[PDB]
Structure 1
Amino acid sequence: VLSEGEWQLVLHVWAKVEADVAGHGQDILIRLFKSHPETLEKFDRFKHLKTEAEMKASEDLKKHGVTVLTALGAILKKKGHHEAELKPLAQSHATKHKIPIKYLEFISEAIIHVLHSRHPGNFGADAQGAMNKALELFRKDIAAKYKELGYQG
């Protein structure tokens, strides 16, 4: 459980993110794909983009970044009461997409990296610790779900 003050820290940076969801989403996916190229394999629609320049030019890649950040944002804004949101998310990612927990760790690092880079005034040690905690809670809950659904992780 996060404290109210830790949630405030998360939601105050998140409100910066939402001034430009598309640019943020783009940076985060590209950071992910270049830090850990193997995750690109999970996307049959992206696995075919070869350079950062190509990633930057893809409109579907940008549209997908917005889908990810909007879904994560709706979860973060529940302040821990997110079970109804996780259920459909857990099902499609365990069954259809088959995404390992380890890759959720990856994108979590990408997210933290980009917020630190684009919002240092709002992402000091305290707020980064709060975001980490909030993301660990998300990954923990989706893992418990993965197992109920029959998926290893």
Structure 2
Amino acid sequence: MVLSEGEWQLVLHVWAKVEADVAGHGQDIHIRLFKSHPETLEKFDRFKHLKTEAEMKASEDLKKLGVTVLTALGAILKKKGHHEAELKPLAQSHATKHKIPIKYLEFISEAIIHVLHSRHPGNFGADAQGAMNKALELFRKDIAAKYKELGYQG
């Protein structure tokens, strides 16, 4: 798939707002993911024990991880589809070290969309949401293709 420049503009415009508070957005997104799909929390040996949202908010390690995640995703989005180099190490660790199924990448995409809709309604109307969804679908499609080449595809 290919996004138009107008669609990229909508994506980078709301992302610029997210970048005003990377740590906060990182936390909201992960808490949303863990509360909505608890099975995803099992993949983090480091955080598996967290029982409540209060404990999640209090975790400094979880906050650090959220920043790392959003920083990596932001770097990919800013490439506007030319993200081959950035995708390789990400696909390798998630397929072979962490073993993260494509399904879980769809769950976090839902969490990202939920949080942006909630925090940035004025910059996340229907058109902007469609553009972000398209960007994340492109990301998942390319990651899935890489998973297959790496021998995991799941």
What TM-score do the two structures reach when normalised by structure 2?
A: 0.99
Instruction: Give, in whole Å, the separation in 1 of the partners of 2:97 and 2:60.
Output: 23
Shift of residue 56, structure 1, vs aligned partner: 0.5
1:152 Cα deviation after fit: 2.6
Gap regions ≥5 residues in structure 2: none
Moved over 2 A (4+): none
Deviations 1:73-107 (A, max 9, x none): 00000000000000000000000000000000000
Q: Which sections of structure 1, spanning at least 5 residues, go unmatched?
A: none
Say if 2:145 and 2:153, in contact at 8 Å, map to a contact too.
no
Output the CA distance in 1 between the equivalents of 2:135 and 2:141.
Answer: 10
Looking at structure 2, the residues matched to 141 and 17 of structure 1 have their Cα atoms a distance apart, in angstroms, of 24
Q: Give the aligned CA root-mean-square deviation in angstroms.
A: 0.3
Partner of 1:95: helix, strand, or coil? helix
CA distance in 1, matches of 2:122, 2:100: 33
CA apart distance, 1:138: 0.1
| 1:31-58 C-alpha deviation (Å, 9 max, x unpaired) | 0000000000000010001000000000
Contact 2:27 2:66 in 1 (8 A): yes
Once the two structures are TM-superposed, the CA of residue 67 in structure 1 deviates from its matched residue by 0.4
Question: Aligned equivalents of 2:122 and 2:110: distance in 1?
Answer: 19
- CA distance in structure 1 between the aligned counterparts of 2:3 and 2:134, rounded to whole angstroms: 7
- SS state at 2:82 partner: coil
CA distance in 2, matches of 1:95, 1:78: 25
Q: TM-score, normalised to structure 1's length?
A: 1.00
Percent identity (aligned): 99
Question: Does residue 112 of structure 2 align to residue 94 of structure 1?
Answer: no
- 1:61 is displaced (CA, Å) by 0.3
